[PDB]
Amino acid sequence: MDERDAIVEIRAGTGGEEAALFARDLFNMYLRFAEEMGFETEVLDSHPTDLGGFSKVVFEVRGPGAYGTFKYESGVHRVQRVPVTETQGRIHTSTATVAVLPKAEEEDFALNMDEIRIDVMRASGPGGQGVNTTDSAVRVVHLPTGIMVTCQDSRSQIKNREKALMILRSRLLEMKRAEEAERLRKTRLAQIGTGERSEKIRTYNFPQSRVTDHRIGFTTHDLEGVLSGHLTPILEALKRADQERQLAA
RNA sequence: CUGACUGGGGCCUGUAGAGCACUGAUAGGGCUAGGGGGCCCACCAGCCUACCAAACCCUGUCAAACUCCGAAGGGUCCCAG
RNA sequence: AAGUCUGGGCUAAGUGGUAAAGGAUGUGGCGCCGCGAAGACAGCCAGGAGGUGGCUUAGAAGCAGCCAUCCUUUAAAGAG
RNA sequence: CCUAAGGUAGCGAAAUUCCUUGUCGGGUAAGUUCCGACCUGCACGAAAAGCGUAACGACCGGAGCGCUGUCUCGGCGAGGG
RNA sequence: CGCCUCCUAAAAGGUAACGGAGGCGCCCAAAGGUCCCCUCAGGCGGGACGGAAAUCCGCCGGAGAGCGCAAGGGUAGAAGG
RNA sequence: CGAUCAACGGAUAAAAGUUACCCCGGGGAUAACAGGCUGAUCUCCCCCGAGCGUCCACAGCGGCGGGGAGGUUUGGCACCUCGAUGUCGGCUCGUCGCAUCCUGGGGCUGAAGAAGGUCCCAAGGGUUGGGCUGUUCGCCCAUUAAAGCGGCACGCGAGCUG
RNA sequence: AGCGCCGGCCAACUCCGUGCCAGCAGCCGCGGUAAUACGGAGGGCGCGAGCGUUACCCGGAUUCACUGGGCGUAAAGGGC
RNA sequence: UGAAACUCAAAGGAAUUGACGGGGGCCCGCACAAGCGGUGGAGCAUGUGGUUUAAUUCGAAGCAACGCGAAGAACCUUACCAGGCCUUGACAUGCUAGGGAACCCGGGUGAAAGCCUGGGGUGCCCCGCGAGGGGAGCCCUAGCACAGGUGCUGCAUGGC
RNA sequence: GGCGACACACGUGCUACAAUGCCCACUACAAAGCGAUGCCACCCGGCAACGGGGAGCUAAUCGCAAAAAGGUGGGCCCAGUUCGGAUUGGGGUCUGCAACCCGACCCCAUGAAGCCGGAAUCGCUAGUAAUCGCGGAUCAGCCAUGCCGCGGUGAAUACG
RNA sequence: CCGAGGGUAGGGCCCGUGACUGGGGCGAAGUCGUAACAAGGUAGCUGUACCGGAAGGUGCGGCUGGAU
RNA sequence: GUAAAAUGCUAAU
RNA sequence: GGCGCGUUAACAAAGCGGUUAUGUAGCGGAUUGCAAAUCCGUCUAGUCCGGUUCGACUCCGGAACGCGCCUCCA
Ligand SMILES: [K+]
Ligand SMILES: [Mg+2]
Ligand SMILES: [Mg+2]
Ligand SMILES: [Mg+2]
Ligand SMILES: [Mg+2]
Ligand SMILES: [Mg+2]
Ligand SMILES: [Mg+2]
Ligand SMILES: [Mg+2]
Ligand SMILES: [Mg+2]
Ligand SMILES: [Mg+2]
Ligand SMILES: [Mg+2]
Ligand SMILES: [Mg+2]
Ligand SMILES: [Mg+2]
Ligand SMILES: [Mg+2]
Ligand SMILES: [Mg+2]
Ligand SMILES: [Mg+2]
Ligand SMILES: [Mg+2]
Ligand SMILES: [Mg+2]
Ligand SMILES: [Mg+2]
Ligand SMILES: [Mg+2]
Ligand SMILES: [Mg+2]
Ligand SMILES: [Mg+2]
Ligand SMILES: [Mg+2]
Ligand SMILES: [Mg+2]
Ligand SMILES: [Mg+2]
Ligand SMILES: [Mg+2]
Ligand SMILES: [Mg+2]
Ligand SMILES: [Mg+2]
Ligand SMILES: [Mg+2]
Ligand SMILES: [Mg+2]
Ligand SMILES: [Mg+2]
Ligand SMILES: [Mg+2]
Ligand SMILES: [Mg+2]
Ligand SMILES: [Mg+2]
Ligand SMILES: [Mg+2]
Ligand SMILES: [Mg+2]
Ligand SMILES: [Mg+2]
Ligand SMILES: [Mg+2]
Ligand SMILES: [Mg+2]
Ligand SMILES: [Mg+2]
Ligand SMILES: [Mg+2]
Ligand SMILES: [Mg+2]
Ligand SMILES: [Mg+2]
Ligand SMILES: [Mg+2]
Ligand SMILES: [Mg+2]
Ligand SMILES: [Mg+2]
Ligand SMILES: [Mg+2]
Ligand SMILES: [Mg+2]
Ligand SMILES: [Mg+2]
Ligand SMILES: [Mg+2]
Ligand SMILES: [Mg+2]
Ligand SMILES: [Mg+2]
Ligand SMILES: [Mg+2]
Ligand SMILES: [Mg+2]
Ligand SMILES: [Mg+2]
Ligand SMILES: [Mg+2]
Ligand SMILES: [Mg+2]
Ligand SMILES: [Mg+2]
Ligand SMILES: [Mg+2]
Ligand SMILES: [Mg+2]
Ligand SMILES: [Mg+2]
Ligand SMILES: [Mg+2]
Ligand SMILES: [Mg+2]
Ligand SMILES: [Mg+2]
Ligand SMILES: [Mg+2]
Ligand SMILES: [Mg+2]
Ligand SMILES: [Mg+2]
Ligand SMILES: [Mg+2]
Ligand SMILES: [Mg+2]
Ligand SMILES: [Mg+2]
Ligand SMILES: [Mg+2]
Ligand SMILES: [Mg+2]
Ligand SMILES: [Mg+2]
Ligand SMILES: [Mg+2]
Ligand SMILES: [Mg+2]
Ligand SMILES: [Mg+2]
Ligand SMILES: [Mg+2]
Ligand SMILES: [Mg+2]
Ligand SMILES: [Mg+2]
Ligand SMILES: [Mg+2]
Ligand SMILES: [Mg+2]
Ligand SMILES: [Mg+2]
Ligand SMILES: [Mg+2]
Ligand SMILES: [Mg+2]
Ligand SMILES: [Mg+2]
Ligand SMILES: [Mg+2]
Ligand SMILES: [Mg+2]
Ligand SMILES: [Mg+2]
Ligand SMILES: [Mg+2]
Ligand SMILES: [Mg+2]
Ligand SMILES: [Mg+2]
Ligand SMILES: [Mg+2]
Ligand SMILES: [Mg+2]
Ligand SMILES: [Mg+2]
Ligand SMILES: [Mg+2]
Ligand SMILES: [Mg+2]
Ligand SMILES: [Mg+2]
Ligand SMILES: [Mg+2]
Ligand SMILES: [Mg+2]
Ligand SMILES: [Mg+2]
Ligand SMILES: [Mg+2]
Ligand SMILES: [Mg+2]
Ligand SMILES: [Mg+2]
Ligand SMILES: [Mg+2]
Ligand SMILES: [Mg+2]
Ligand SMILES: [Mg+2]
Ligand SMILES: [Mg+2]
Ligand SMILES: [Mg+2]
Ligand SMILES: [Mg+2]
Ligand SMILES: [Mg+2]
Ligand SMILES: [Mg+2]
Ligand SMILES: [Mg+2]
Ligand SMILES: [Mg+2]
Ligand SMILES: [Mg+2]
Ligand SMILES: [Mg+2]
Ligand SMILES: [Mg+2]
Ligand SMILES: [Mg+2]
Ligand SMILES: [Mg+2]
Ligand SMILES: [Mg+2]
Ligand SMILES: [Mg+2]
Ligand SMILES: [Mg+2]
Ligand SMILES: [Mg+2]
Ligand SMILES: [Mg+2]
Ligand SMILES: [Mg+2]
Ligand SMILES: [Mg+2]
Ligand SMILES: [Mg+2]
Ligand SMILES: [Mg+2]
Ligand SMILES: [Mg+2]
Ligand SMILES: [Mg+2]
Ligand SMILES: [Mg+2]
Ligand SMILES: [Mg+2]
Ligand SMILES: [Mg+2]
Ligand SMILES: [Mg+2]
Ligand SMILES: [Mg+2]
Ligand SMILES: [Mg+2]
Ligand SMILES: [Mg+2]
Ligand SMILES: [Mg+2]
Ligand SMILES: [Mg+2]
Ligand SMILES: [Mg+2]
Ligand SMILES: [Mg+2]
Ligand SMILES: [Mg+2]
Ligand SMILES: [Mg+2]
Ligand SMILES: [Mg+2]
Ligand SMILES: [Mg+2]
Ligand SMILES: [Mg+2]
Ligand SMILES: [Mg+2]
Ligand SMILES: [Mg+2]
Ligand SMILES: [Mg+2]
Ligand SMILES: [Mg+2]
Ligand SMILES: [Mg+2]
Ligand SMILES: [Mg+2]
Ligand SMILES: [Mg+2]
Ligand SMILES: [Mg+2]
Ligand SMILES: [Mg+2]
Ligand SMILES: [Mg+2]
Ligand SMILES: [Mg+2]
Ligand SMILES: [Mg+2]
Ligand SMILES: [Mg+2]
Ligand SMILES: [Mg+2]
Ligand SMILES: [Mg+2]
Ligand SMILES: [Mg+2]
Ligand SMILES: [Mg+2]
Ligand SMILES: [Mg+2]
Ligand SMILES: [Mg+2]
Ligand SMILES: [Mg+2]
Ligand SMILES: [Mg+2]
Ligand SMILES: [Mg+2]
Ligand SMILES: [Mg+2]
Ligand SMILES: [Mg+2]
Ligand SMILES: [Mg+2]
Ligand SMILES: [Mg+2]
Ligand SMILES: [Mg+2]
Ligand SMILES: [Mg+2]
Ligand SMILES: [Mg+2]
Ligand SMILES: [Mg+2]
Ligand SMILES: [Mg+2]
Ligand SMILES: [Mg+2]
Ligand SMILES: [Mg+2]
Ligand SMILES: [Mg+2]
Ligand SMILES: [Mg+2]
Ligand SMILES: [Mg+2]
Ligand SMILES: [Mg+2]
Ligand SMILES: [Mg+2]
Ligand SMILES: [Mg+2]
Ligand SMILES: [Mg+2]
Ligand SMILES: [Mg+2]
Ligand SMILES: [Mg+2]
Ligand SMILES: [Mg+2]
Ligand SMILES: [Mg+2]
Ligand SMILES: [Mg+2]
Ligand SMILES: [Mg+2]
Ligand SMILES: [Mg+2]
Ligand SMILES: [Mg+2]
Ligand SMILES: [Mg+2]
Ligand SMILES: [Mg+2]
Ligand SMILES: [Mg+2]
Ligand SMILES: [Mg+2]
Ligand SMILES: [Mg+2]
Ligand SMILES: [Mg+2]
Ligand SMILES: [Mg+2]
Ligand SMILES: [Mg+2]
Ligand SMILES: [Mg+2]
Ligand SMILES: [Mg+2]
Ligand SMILES: [Mg+2]
Ligand SMILES: [Mg+2]
Ligand SMILES: [Mg+2]
Ligand SMILES: [Mg+2]
Ligand SMILES: [Mg+2]
Ligand SMILES: [Mg+2]
Ligand SMILES: [Mg+2]
Ligand SMILES: [Mg+2]
Ligand SMILES: [Mg+2]
Ligand SMILES: [Mg+2]
Ligand SMILES: [Mg+2]
Ligand SMILES: [Mg+2]
Ligand SMILES: [Mg+2]
Ligand SMILES: [Mg+2]
Ligand SMILES: [Mg+2]
Ligand SMILES: [Mg+2]
Ligand SMILES: [Mg+2]
Ligand SMILES: [Mg+2]
């Protein structure tokens, strides 16, 4: 939560080459805000455009109390300006999306052998006297979920039991790595959506030198300072609105 | 008459045990290179630490391929039964 | 086949006559301090209180976790 | 990077799939078999032919109707012993 | 799978296991013979370039160096230079 | 003088495989089944009491470690049997153990009642029918007071099946 | 005394708010900080115990053409 | 032989003026060619991006932004930043209250600004030799209407 | 205080890398402008920047004024040098209230890069290019090597 | 006898629905190339055939709705 | 019969 | 489990007892209205532990991870 390090995913939205540039503009704005808050940034995955932008940049903000501040940036950011890609001096409206997520654990996986039942029995197929009378085949049952692995690959019960336990764990692991990805997904779609011109959280209107956070109504005119990092005025204005969002019925 | 076995006497040995002098291991303490941290400074060095610890020292130990030591026995020759 | 042989002791579990960590007012024999008619130990008969609690906590206010356990009438009363 | 060149069409958990009773659908009250699909094909593949194909089969799977001493679960009778 | 070294091996010699650890299948014309001469590793201090360590000086230092190559024995009163 | 005759006391100057088409002579000197010894593995029961359980170590639990029992599993060993000890599962027929699935009798409970949990005593009797697969095992359907776990050459082929 | 409408078609316009949001929409389109096109207000236009909408039929549609259409290149001559 | 759902607000024909062509033709320009000196490398000057900064004011952006606005940044310039003052204000008009001033020398205190200060001297008609009483430049405090803004929009504009 | 920051990157220029050159001495020929808290002749002190004197001129009259390349004479001898003049130390001059950030200039010392510049790229067709000095605006002084001007000397080549 | 209808068995047509699968329409931004419109940088288009990630390419024959 | 080195540029009257 | 092979920078991938590998990318410039393509330049390394050697990415020994093969007669 609020106190833990967090990860900011900046993707480009509607706009094409111009969105990937505005996404670069959002990316410098956020690194320079971290330096102001004495935070620490490291990039994890960046997809650049030869024009100078990024289709995607993913970076961490290391420091005590990161998810407390950046969490207000998740949403669709709208830019309206004359693009450096435009030739006929027109104003285009383009969008970039920002997803903010707390850095989690890479927690290690192991088997609780008290919720696991191991069955042994005779195997199938060839072997003569051996296969007839030897308990080589192994079934391992994960008791809470019911999923089972069986193994009679070798002639030895201990070898088949070890190999069976390996597959069971590796299987339970992927079940766990998939539910986590399903939650990581529905959460990202909760913050980013389709990245449409609507769905906007903030407008950066370069002609009017205006930045507007339509969630609260706040607007400054220091669009140069906002783009250079000085976001602290806006954050507080939401932090205030957050407390006045907590008004006991 | 030289035999097994036995009495005396000389010489050879590195085990049991023990030990730490060598080769290694080793707990804690002292002292004390170097590192971590470290208040501070890079104009130049200092200072701090109930951090990790080289060497050295103290107490306490470990070893088939460690021995400053070291039996009981064993081997061999001589003389005698 | 030859002692229901003699003398001293232990065991009550048929232990003897099939086993360990560990547990035990089993029983017998030694020790070592301690308290005792400055009336001890056991029971009984009293008192065993007061500032009333320091953190935590809507009460945890003698009678939760945490922080230390000052003192009065004294023959004594721990904020237990 | 390497090879002489890197498996084409078509087919695929198969007379081939180890993990495997893969997964999804169908059938059943319930289906490790069956049929239809999917394709990370351990280890299909083009005359040791590939994929289909009406008709044929004392070949080998799966299902239904009919009917039953196969069975619930056994009883009685006959004749040769 | 032959050969060498150490241990196991129970203090003479010898002694097994698909027991524990290593090495050999070369080399040297001097790394051989003799005579003569010389003595290490390491530590502290000192010294342009020059450092942990190149060469030079002092003091301490019995052998922990060296002995082509594995290990053991041996060894400066030399087998070392 | 010519040897990785290195399988290094060196068969020839000169040499690889396959047999489920197989064969003879031998061995329980030696493997596969079962027994035996052992019990690492397996199953069961304890000791310790850190900690969980709002509170409270012990209702129910038991970190790190410790001690055993059993002789169902997988092994180790190679002791009777290789002039033969027929090997999976099913069927049929049982019998025994008890570490008890149900039924009977109890103690504790974080037991209001009903219903459970946990441990103790108890082996008299009981412990169903079906779908899948050769299966043992397991899953599933429908019930049940319950749908126990083991030994008997993994009981039982001069009893059947195959 | 109410209901529809006032960008064009189509009769009836100005001010504030909003700022591709909120919304309008029968078609062409409106709205991205000076909107007669969104919402309100004033003002206007049309009907009036009614005003609008939705559905459906004919019309406009000579757009199934008898009245009253077409086929070189727009859809349209059959390969002969 | 020959549909439908769904969907679009058009799909089309010919012709016009353009623009474009790695179409043609005919022309031209230091456009190439033909020449001569350079730039790109070096050191400095200057402008700029970027980084940095409390601030490093802002505008200029291919040719046609970059010794450009700037034909002169130590202060001033100066629009930026830090700290100290200012409240009809540095300036404009007009209206009411205390004054009634105009102007010129000083005093503290402060970095200065500013704040608190202490000396004095007026016009016009007059009632006038009256105490002096008014109209009376201008000046200062109470209030006003107000000013001030290099704050934004060169995509609302003029001018250049 | 900043606008003058400095790991870096680009544009415009200046100065060079040398002998058809550098140096010293002496000796010539311009044009355009500017000049009253203004230009400064001339004289002295100072190596010099400058200072103190101090004529003349609202200026075809007095001054800024040396033009520079050029010429004659002598020197350097092919070297990172008598080429180059960056960087830094020290001692001073002037403006200005005030030169730390952050001015210009003078003298002494220090004497860096640089040996003609990769891919690439700019200008110029005649008094042009190149080379050489001069003045002005702004302006207290100046970071001007910039701008706008002015004359001196004076080419190569254009088939197409 | 016929006979409502009930039952048995086999056909026809229609509607809904189905693991999976085939393309189609739409989209103010994505990935790969650039086939077509200029001789579109290999004139295009065409029926058919074979091939290729994709547009497409190539063979055979046809068309001009092709350039100079 | 001729005779091309060279790909691309989203989205706001 | 046995046996063989391997670990190198951003990626893929080599040689070598003493020593800028290489290609593509990345970075600075050039060219273009801009991007690509193209052109001039530029460069970061040897998994861990222990030995040998004057010297180890390179040789020996072990660890960890990956790949290939085998695991048969009951
Ligand atoms: K066989
Ligand atoms: Mg991406
Ligand atoms: Mg464009
Ligand atoms: Mg178990
Ligand atoms: Mg088996
Ligand atoms: Mg089978
Ligand atoms: Mg077989
Ligand atoms: Mg078979
Ligand atoms: Mg067995
Ligand atoms: Mg004798
Ligand atoms: Mg003798
Ligand atoms: Mg001993
Ligand atoms: Mg020792
Ligand atoms: Mg010992
Ligand atoms: Mg010893
Ligand atoms: Mg002694
Ligand atoms: Mg003796
Ligand atoms: Mg003797
Ligand atoms: Mg004798
Ligand atoms: Mg008696
Ligand atoms: Mg007696
Ligand atoms: Mg008893
Ligand atoms: Mg007994
Ligand atoms: Mg007993
Ligand atoms: Mg006792
Ligand atoms: Mg294959
Ligand atoms: Mg192929
Ligand atoms: Mg094919
Ligand atoms: Mg295929
Ligand atoms: Mg398949
Ligand atoms: Mg299947
Ligand atoms: Mg198949
Ligand atoms: Mg196969
Ligand atoms: Mg399978
Ligand atoms: Mg299988
Ligand atoms: Mg299944
Ligand atoms: Mg199924
Ligand atoms: Mg089903
Ligand atoms: Mg079946
Ligand atoms: Mg199938
Ligand atoms: Mg698969
Ligand atoms: Mg085949
Ligand atoms: Mg094959
Ligand atoms: Mg073939
Ligand atoms: Mg063949
Ligand atoms: Mg073939
Ligand atoms: Mg087939
Ligand atoms: Mg057919
Ligand atoms: Mg068939
Ligand atoms: Mg058929
Ligand atoms: Mg047949
Ligand atoms: Mg047949
Ligand atoms: Mg036949
Ligand atoms: Mg059937
Ligand atoms: Mg049936
Ligand atoms: Mg039937
Ligand atoms: Mg019968
Ligand atoms: Mg009968
Ligand atoms: Mg009969
Ligand atoms: Mg031999
Ligand atoms: Mg040998
Ligand atoms: Mg011995
Ligand atoms: Mg020995
Ligand atoms: Mg001995
Ligand atoms: Mg001997
Ligand atoms: Mg041996
Ligand atoms: Mg031997
Ligand atoms: Mg060897
Ligand atoms: Mg020698
Ligand atoms: Mg020698
Ligand atoms: Mg000699
Ligand atoms: Mg020494
Ligand atoms: Mg020294
Ligand atoms: Mg030294
Ligand atoms: Mg030695
Ligand atoms: Mg040596
Ligand atoms: Mg060696
Ligand atoms: Mg050999
Ligand atoms: Mg041999
Ligand atoms: Mg041989
Ligand atoms: Mg021998
Ligand atoms: Mg021979
Ligand atoms: Mg021969
Ligand atoms: Mg041979
Ligand atoms: Mg043979
Ligand atoms: Mg065969
Ligand atoms: Mg066969
Ligand atoms: Mg035969
Ligand atoms: Mg055969
Ligand atoms: Mg035969
Ligand atoms: Mg035989
Ligand atoms: Mg025989
Ligand atoms: Mg033998
Ligand atoms: Mg025997
Ligand atoms: Mg056996
Ligand atoms: Mg065995
Ligand atoms: Mg056996
Ligand atoms: Mg066996
Ligand atoms: Mg048996
Ligand atoms: Mg056995
Ligand atoms: Mg037996
Ligand atoms: Mg046991
Ligand atoms: Mg036992
Ligand atoms: Mg055990
Ligand atoms: Mg027990
Ligand atoms: Mg607790
Ligand atoms: Mg309790
Ligand atoms: Mg446990
Ligand atoms: Mg134990
Ligand atoms: Mg035991
Ligand atoms: Mg047994
Ligand atoms: Mg058994
Ligand atoms: Mg056994
Ligand atoms: Mg035996
Ligand atoms: Mg034996
Ligand atoms: Mg046998
Ligand atoms: Mg017999
Ligand atoms: Mg017999
Ligand atoms: Mg027999
Ligand atoms: Mg028999
Ligand atoms: Mg039984
Ligand atoms: Mg019991
Ligand atoms: Mg009961
Ligand atoms: Mg009971
Ligand atoms: Mg009850
Ligand atoms: Mg109970
Ligand atoms: Mg019973
Ligand atoms: Mg059942
Ligand atoms: Mg059935
Ligand atoms: Mg069945
Ligand atoms: Mg079954
Ligand atoms: Mg099974
Ligand atoms: Mg019950
Ligand atoms: Mg039940
Ligand atoms: Mg059984
Ligand atoms: Mg059996
Ligand atoms: Mg049987
Ligand atoms: Mg039989
Ligand atoms: Mg049987
Ligand atoms: Mg039998
Ligand atoms: Mg029999
Ligand atoms: Mg029998
Ligand atoms: Mg059979
Ligand atoms: Mg059969
Ligand atoms: Mg209307
Ligand atoms: Mg109307
Ligand atoms: Mg109208
Ligand atoms: Mg107004
Ligand atoms: Mg409306
Ligand atoms: Mg309408
Ligand atoms: Mg907007
Ligand atoms: Mg507005
Ligand atoms: Mg507008
Ligand atoms: Mg409006
Ligand atoms: Mg509207
Ligand atoms: Mg309307
Ligand atoms: Mg309106
Ligand atoms: Mg009409
Ligand atoms: Mg009509
Ligand atoms: Mg109609
Ligand atoms: Mg008609
Ligand atoms: Mg018509
Ligand atoms: Mg015709
Ligand atoms: Mg036609
Ligand atoms: Mg036809
Ligand atoms: Mg047309
Ligand atoms: Mg044209
Ligand atoms: Mg040229
Ligand atoms: Mg040049
Ligand atoms: Mg240059
Ligand atoms: Mg330059
Ligand atoms: Mg800047
Ligand atoms: Mg502006
Ligand atoms: Mg320019
Ligand atoms: Mg300026
Ligand atoms: Mg300037
Ligand atoms: Mg200023
Ligand atoms: Mg100022
Ligand atoms: Mg304009
Ligand atoms: Mg602008
Ligand atoms: Mg204008
Ligand atoms: Mg500036
Ligand atoms: Mg440069
Ligand atoms: Mg310049
Ligand atoms: Mg330059
Ligand atoms: Mg002058
Ligand atoms: Mg020099
Ligand atoms: Mg040089
Ligand atoms: Mg020089
Ligand atoms: Mg100086
Ligand atoms: Mg300055
Ligand atoms: Mg030179
Ligand atoms: Mg010209
Ligand atoms: Mg000048
Ligand atoms: Mg000036
Ligand atoms: Mg009928
Ligand atoms: Mg009918
Ligand atoms: Mg194309
Ligand atoms: Mg084409
Ligand atoms: Mg093109
Ligand atoms: Mg092309
Ligand atoms: Mg083409
Ligand atoms: Mg074709
Ligand atoms: Mg082709
Ligand atoms: Mg061509
Ligand atoms: Mg290309
Ligand atoms: Mg593209
Ligand atoms: Mg495109
Ligand atoms: Mg192009
Ligand atoms: Mg466009
Ligand atoms: Mg390598
Ligand atoms: Mg790699
Ligand atoms: Mg290579
Ligand atoms: Mg580059
Ligand atoms: Mg570029
Ligand atoms: Mg490279
Ligand atoms: Mg080394
Ligand atoms: Mg090493
Ligand atoms: Mg190296
Ligand atoms: Mg290695
Ligand atoms: Mg075989």
Side-chain angles (χ1 to χ4, degrees), chain A residues 18-35 37-89:
Chain A
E18 215 251 306
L21 300 161
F22 178 54
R24 222 241 204 275
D25 295 322
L26 287 173
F27 168 79
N28 294 168
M29 166 171 109
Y30 284 156
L31 303 183
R32 304 188 62 84
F33 185 47
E35 185 93 55
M37 311 283 103
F39 278 135
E40 172 56 54
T41 51
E42 157 159 273
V43 282
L44 311 177
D45 164 61
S46 95
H47 297 288
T49 296
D50 39 355
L51 235 29
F54 288 107
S55 4
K56 181 180 200 184
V57 261
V58 186
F59 65 103
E60 46 186 50
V61 188
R62 303 192 291 244
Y67 190 72
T69 62
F70 279 75
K71 65 164 137 182
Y72 290 91
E73 306 300 275
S74 82
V76 186
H77 294 197
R78 192 178 72 180
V79 67
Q80 357 197 219
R81 70 196 181 176
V82 168
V84 273
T85 79
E86 173 73 25
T87 311
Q88 320 94 81

Side-chain angles (χ1 to χ4, degrees), chain A residues 188-223 225-236:
Chain A
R188 276 209 196 82
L189 270 52
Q191 303 188 330
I192 274 193
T194 91
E196 212 45 70
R197 236 159 242 120
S198 341
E199 298 174 345
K200 67 211 151 309
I201 240 50
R202 191 176 304 166
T203 302
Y204 304 70
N205 185 284
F206 287 66
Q208 299 320 99
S209 164
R210 191 187 72 252
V211 198
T212 295
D213 195 299
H214 328 64
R215 286 171 294 174
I216 58 186
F218 189 87
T219 156
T220 164
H221 287 79
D222 211 8
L223 173 51
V226 172
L227 290 198
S228 65
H230 316 333
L231 275 173
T232 121
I234 320 191
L235 288 195
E236 307 169 53

Side-chain angles (χ1 to χ4, degrees), chain A residues 79-117:
Chain A
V79 67
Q80 357 197 219
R81 70 196 181 176
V82 168
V84 273
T85 79
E86 173 73 25
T87 311
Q88 320 94 81
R90 297 183 289 159
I91 296 167
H92 288 289
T93 302
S94 297
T95 233
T97 33
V98 173
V100 295
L101 297 142
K103 181 174 245 178
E105 318 258 67
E106 49 121 1
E107 230 340 285
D108 304 322
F109 195 48
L111 297 178
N112 190 19
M113 292 298 238
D114 291 328
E115 12 184 66
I116 293 187
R117 185 239 303 171

Side-chain angles (χ1 to χ4, degrees), chain A residues 113-134:
Chain A
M113 292 298 238
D114 291 328
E115 12 184 66
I116 293 187
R117 185 239 303 171
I118 311 173
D119 295 320
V120 317
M121 72 234 79
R122 258 72 112 284
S124 304
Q129 291 278 6
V131 72
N132 294 353
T133 67
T134 301

Side-chain angles (χ1 to χ4, degrees), chain A residues 154-171:
Chain A
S154 88
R155 303 172 196 241
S156 166
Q157 174 188 300
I158 189 50
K159 285 208 287 149
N160 296 340
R161 202 224 322 285
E162 195 217 3
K163 195 177 194 162
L165 285 169
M166 260 204 295
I167 289 163
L168 176 65
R169 167 201 189 264
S170 147
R171 241 171 224 175

